[PDB]
Design a protein around this ligand. Sequence first.
Ligand SMILES: COc1cc2cc(OC)c1OC[C@H](O)[C@@H](O)CCOC(=O)[C@@H]1CCCCN1C(=O)[C@H]2C1CCCCC1
Length: 128
Amino acid sequence: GAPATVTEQGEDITSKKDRGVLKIVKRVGNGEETPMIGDKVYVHYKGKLSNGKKFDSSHDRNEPFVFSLGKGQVIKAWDIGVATMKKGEIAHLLIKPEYAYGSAGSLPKIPSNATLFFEIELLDFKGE
Ligand SMILES: COc1cc2cc(OC)c1OC[C@H](O)[C@@H](O)CCOC(=O)[C@@H]1CCCCN1C(=O)[C@H]2C1CCCCC1
């Protein structure tokens, strides 16, 4: 499946190279620009727990997920992984707990020490 493909062929995009955030680009975007910290970012996403017990998509809310990059409003792995994307790009991220909800989890939504998977599409980003 998609998460196993990410384990085996995905790029380690963490600074510490501890494989905590792995990425495959699944649809290439356009332009050279990727978002800077502080930029307003609009995405669609699907996500799941590696235990298969919970799934979440922006399309449920019928509308883009909007957030300010690097402003600690999402998990570390998103600040790291969305910053690497181009406008129009679809990527797959597989994320160890240290870059998500940690040992404590976000009980009981996110269990303790959960690995997470997302499919993210970067729709647009604007200057603060
Ligand atoms: C722990 O709580 C949540 C987790 C997620 C979705 C939630 O609501 C839509 C949610 O509760 C509201 C909270 O406001 C979130 O924003 C926290 C930040 O969320 C993120 O940082 C990450 C990345 C941005 C998209 C949402 N995502 C999540 O962790 C989802 C998870 C994904 C795994 C499967 C369960 C939902």
